Structures are given as structure tokens and as C-alpha cells.
Write a protein that binds this ligand. Sequence first.
Ligand SMILES: Nc1nc2c(ncn2[C@@H]2O[C@H](COP(=O)(O)OP(=O)(O)NP(=O)(O)O)[C@@H](O)[C@H]2O)c(=O)[nH]1
Ligand SMILES: [Mg+2]
Length: 176
Amino acid sequence: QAIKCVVVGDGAVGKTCLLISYTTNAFPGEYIPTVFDNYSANVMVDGKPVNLGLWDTAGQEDYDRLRPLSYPQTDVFLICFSLVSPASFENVRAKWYPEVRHHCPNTPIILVGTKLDLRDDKDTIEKLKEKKLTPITYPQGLAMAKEIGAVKYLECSALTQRGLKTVFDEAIRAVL
Ligand SMILES: Nc1nc2c(ncn2[C@@H]2O[C@H](COP(=O)(O)OP(=O)(O)NP(=O)(O)O)[C@@H](O)[C@H]2O)c(=O)[nH]1
Ligand SMILES: [Mg+2]
């Protein structure tokens, strides 16, 4: 079964790394901003084989009139935000949930907190502290998910791969 999955979210949240770590079991060298890339993976979820078409989108605001072109016939959306960027988190409800629902009213949304490894990280906590900012907790993620009518909230690290397979397993489970 062919399943189309589109990934959106603010620039630098870890969309590309998420997709490349999942499909190749390797974390990308540098940070090259995505224009548009196309990945695929053969998955087995609950006894079913699936062709998972993964569509990587640009998080830069410049591509606002270009991004909705990826949206038709989408089976499941991943809206991504960094657990370590409150700003990216606020934009889940301010930008990404509205943009997805204006074009795809019904398509299931999975909300995905990325960079889980960085949540308990010393340098990062302290760097957010100096701006009177704090990492996004799990309860807040779940409330945001309910807020945007997401079908699942999941947390993962593209770096350690912690929670990474479940993201896509649940993405497929929201279509099936
Ligand atoms: N610690 C940590 N860093 C991560 C993780 N995922 C991505 N990063 C870092 O975050 C930066 C952005 O990653 P990237 O996947 O390119 O984000 P993006 O959402 O694709 N950006 P764009 O919208 O511009 O394409 C990179 O420096 C990358 O190494 C993660 O799970 N943990
Ligand atoms: Mg990218």
C-alpha cells in the first residue's frame, strides 16, 4: 500500500535529519536548508507492507506559496517542532496547523517533538535560561496536540534514534 507522508515545521527543527536518520540509519553531516527532497521506505506495520513516500518540505517562510503544492493526496502530515525551541512550538498552532488544514481539512496530523536528546542537555537548558525560556515538556506537547486536533503526539531524537521508528509506525497507523 502506497502512503504519502508530508513533513512540515519551522526551519532548523530537524525535519531532514528526522527523515534521513529514519531511512538510512545515519545522521546528516552538516546543515543544508531543504528546498524539496523525496525519500521512501519499505515498512511492515501490524502485518501490512507499506510503501512510505516521505516528502521533505522547506521550513523557511519564503516557500509559503510553494509548499502547499506538496499537499494534495497527502495521507498523513507530520507537524514538527523542536522540544528545545518554544518559538517553533508556538508556530505549530500559529502557522503549521492553519496552513495544513486550509488545504487538507481532514488529513490526520501527527505532532512530533524533535531533538529529544537536547531536553535534558546542560548547555541547552542554560542557553534557554538566559532568555527566560524553558524546554517544552511532554504534557505541553500533548495539550498542543489536542489543541490542533492531532491524532498522536510523539517525541523523538534524530541523533540517538530514540522514539524515531514510532513516529513513522504511528504515521502509518493513522492512515490504515
Ligand atoms: N541534538 C540534535 N540536533 C538535531 C537533531 N535533528 C536535527 N538536529 C540539528 O538541527 C539542525 C537542523 O536540522 P534539519 O534537519 O536540517 O532541520 P530542518 O527542519 O530540515 N531545516 P529546514 O526547514 O531549513 O530544512 C542541524 O544542525 C541538525 O544537526 C536531533 O535529533 N538532535
Ligand atoms: Mg531540511
